[PDB]
UniProtKB/Swiss-Prot annotation, chain A:
Keyword hit for Acetylation: yes
Domain PCI positions: 1-116
Protein name: 26S proteasome non-ATPase regulatory subunit 12
Record bears the keyword DNA damage: no
GO CC terms: cytoplasm; cytosol; extracellular exosome; extracellular region; ficolin-1-rich granule lumen; membrane; nucleoplasm; proteasome accessory complex
Disorder named in the UniProt entry: Stankiewicz-Isidor syndrome: A neurodevelopmental disorder characterized by delayed psychomotor development, intellectual disability, behavioral disorders, mild dysmorphism, ophthalmologic anomalies, feeding difficulties, deafness, and variable congenital malformations of the cardiac and/or urogenital systems.
Modified residues (N6-acetyllysine): 64
Part of the full-length chain shown: 305 to 456 of 456
Physiological role: Component of the 26S proteasome, a multiprotein complex involved in the ATP-dependent degradation of ubiquitinated proteins. This complex plays a key role in the maintenance of protein homeostasis by removing misfolded or damaged proteins, which could impair cellular functions, and by removing proteins whose functions are no longer required. Therefore, the proteasome participates in numerous cellular processes, including cell cycle progression, apoptosis, or DNA damage repair.
UniProtKB/Swiss-Prot annotation, chain B:
Post-translational modification Phosphoserine, affected residues: 28
Shown chain mapped onto the complete sequence: 197 to 253 of 310
Assembly information from the UniProt record: Component of the 19S proteasome regulatory particle complex. The 26S proteasome consists of a 20S core particle (CP) and two 19S regulatory subunits (RP). The regulatory particle is made of a lid composed of 9 subunits including PSMD4, a base containing 6 ATPases and few additional components. Within the complex, PSMD4 interacts with subunit PSMD7 through their respective MPN domain. Interacts with TXNL1.
Main function: Component of the 26S proteasome, a multiprotein complex involved in the ATP-dependent degradation of ubiquitinated proteins. This complex plays a key role in the maintenance of protein homeostasis by removing misfolded or damaged proteins, which could impair cellular functions, and by removing proteins whose functions are no longer required. Therefore, the proteasome participates in numerous cellular processes, including cell cycle progression, apoptosis, or DNA damage repair.
Origin superkingdom: Eukaryota
Name of the molecule in the record: 26S proteasome non-ATPase regulatory subunit 14
Family membership: Belongs to the peptidase M67A family. PSMD14 subfamily.
Tissue: Widely expressed. Highest levels in heart and skeletal muscle.
């Protein structure tokens, strides 16, 4: 639950394979795991759509960061084929991936670097940066000027 | 005006009221650090004033 809470670090599910296996083996708690796998197809849909759901959720988490994870290398670290990653993109087109940038020559994707209108985006960033430096510079300057008065 | 008249009125202001109230009113129309709201309009010329320029045209 803590790994699924937030800031999901890219980890291998093989460590979760034995966790789910012993989750089916041990009967002290969460016993009806065989009842979760009761149906021949329902448990398979819950498992495939579960690993799919976390392998999409971690993409939705790393999509906030603009670090350019270079999904071509990520497909190598995850040890999976790029075809089901294209199917994952088929899940992103319905998962509202319209804010992205792809490349015909290479395979690297970009979740940022828009057309960047200078009247809105650089306007906003320059407003928050310049104004934040102005008022933040204003607070601790005279605040420290009042802190040095106690030395007399 | 019968049995009821009035008198003239003048004022007086020293330099302490002149500079304290004058600089106090100029500061009352100015900013805190005086550099805060300048870039606000300098960068609003590209976002908000453009509508006022199109309407002006």
């Amino acid at each position: 639950l803590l790994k699924l809470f937030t800031t999901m670090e890219l980890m291998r599910w093989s460590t979760l394979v034995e966790d789910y296996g012993m989750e089916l083996r041990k009967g002290s708690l969460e016993s009806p795991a065989t009842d979760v796998f009761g149906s021949t197809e329902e448990g398979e849909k819950r498992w495939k759509d579960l690993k799919n759901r976390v392998v999409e959720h971690n993409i939705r988490i790393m999509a906030k960061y603009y670090t350019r994870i270079t999904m071509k290398r990520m497909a190598q670290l995850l040890d999976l084929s790029v075809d089901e990653s294209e199917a994952f993109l088929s899940n992103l087109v319905v998962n509202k991936t319209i804010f992205a940038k792809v490349d015909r020559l290479a395979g690297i994707i970009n979740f940022q670097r828009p057309k960047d209108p200078n009247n809105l985006l650089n306007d906003w960033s320059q407003k928050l940066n310049s104004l934040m430096s102005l008022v933040n510079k204003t607070t601790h300057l005279i605040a420290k000027e009042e802190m040095i008065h106690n030395l007399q | 005006n019968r049995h009821y008249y009035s008198i003239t009125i003048n004022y007086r202001k020293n330099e302490l009221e002149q500079k304290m109230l004058l600089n106090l009113h100029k500061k009352s129309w100015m900013e805190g650090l005086t550099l805060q709201d300048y870039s606000e309009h300098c960068k609003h010329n590209e976002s908000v004033v453009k509508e006022m320029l199109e309407l002006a045209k």
